[PDB]
Symmetry: none
Subunit: 55 residues, 2 copies
DNA sequence: GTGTAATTTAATTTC
DNA sequence: CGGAAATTAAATTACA
């Protein structure tokens, strides 16, 4: 049960609001940049888009 | 779609017998369980996926 | 008590 | 076409 940071959260949000689907070579980039694992990022995307399904 | 327990149990039996499904088996399974052969095909796919993951 | 990460299961796109 | 590998959506389960 991981908890994400603030600096990391703003980045995932920006990357989302630009494109809701992240590119594999972009997602590795983000993943090694923010220090997280590429899996966390994906699951975060899924849980994000959940909010999209709320409208 | 949500599968029943009965359906999961049938799918489970048919898989544990032979891991790869034949056309007459997906027609039969589709016709008894009420599903589409595609639903079933997908089910075998996801099953073998689970076995190779563990 | 809400909010969200992580887990299943059914369905998809691509090689 | 059917199958394998990688993602996605939908619904639920546990930590937060």
């Amino acid at each position: 049960r991981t908890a994400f940071s603030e600096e990391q959260k703003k980045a995932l949000d920006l990357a989302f609001y630009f494109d809701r689907y992240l590119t594999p070579e972009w997602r590795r980039y983000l993943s090694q940049r923010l220090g997280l694992n590429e899996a966390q990022i994906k699951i975060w995307f899924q849980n994000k888009r959940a909010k999209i399904k709320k409208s």
